[PDB]
Amino acid sequence: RGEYSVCDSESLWVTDKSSAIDIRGHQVTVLGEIKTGNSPVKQYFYETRCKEARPVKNGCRGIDDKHWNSQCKTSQTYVRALTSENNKLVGWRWIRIDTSCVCALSRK
Amino acid sequence: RGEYSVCDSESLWVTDKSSAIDIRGHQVTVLGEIKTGNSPVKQYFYETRCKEARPVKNGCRGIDDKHWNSQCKTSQTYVRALTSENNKLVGWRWIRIDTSCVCALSRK
Numbered sequence A, B: 001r002g003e004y005s006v007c008d009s010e011s012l013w014v015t016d017k018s019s020a021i022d023i024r025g026h027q028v029t030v031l032g033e034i035k036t037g038n039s040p041v042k043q044y045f046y047e048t049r050c051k052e053a054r055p056v057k058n059g060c061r062g063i064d065d066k067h068w069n070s071q072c073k074t075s076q077t078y079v080r081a082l083t084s085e086n087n088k089l090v091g092w093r094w095i096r097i098d099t100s101c102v103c104a105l106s107r108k
Helices: none
Strands: A009-014 A019-021 A027-030 A045-050 A069-084 A090-106 B009-014 B019-021 B027-030 B045-050 B069-084 B090-106
Touching: A019 A090, A027 A090, A045 A069, A045 B069, A069 B045, A069 B090, A090 B069, A090 B090, B019 B090, B027 B090, B045 B069
Parallel strands: A045 A090, B045 B090
Antiparallel strands: A009 A045, A019 A027, A027 A069, A069 A090, B009 B045, B019 B027, B027 B069, B069 B090
């Protein structure tokens, strides 16, 4: 996979996540825990983002300079989370979360 | 983000996932459902992979030809899943899952 890759990134374990955006676009609260009838489990996330928009002054690494215009951007994906709205009723919802670092191309 | 991007990909909702590899490397079973004491919720996944290893005969799009050697590869990340081993005891474990399509660079 893109170890060195065209764009550099970082992966980390997020443990504080308390709110987030829905697949519907809503801003919801993310619970700190999960379960019942057994010991409780913590709700955390494995996320990965870009280090910086341009590993090379031009843009992403390994590009055509003249023929292109680039930039590294962090992409999100959907993951299910135990969430709440208003804090009232709790349930599972798809929330957006950083998951990779992609190289976006342009022309001119 | 990488709409057109250097590598093309596809995102889909996976509903049949029945087994998977751990952060520990174990092959575990993924449950079809989640919850208790309330109506049950289905366990599915939002995954994204590459269309094909090389959008351009050379490799990824927007590369330096002579100065580089590339290829698009699909990357996985960790997501929590209600899993079981042997099918005996059930619980939450981090499982590997396709989450993006990255461009890997070489030299020569």
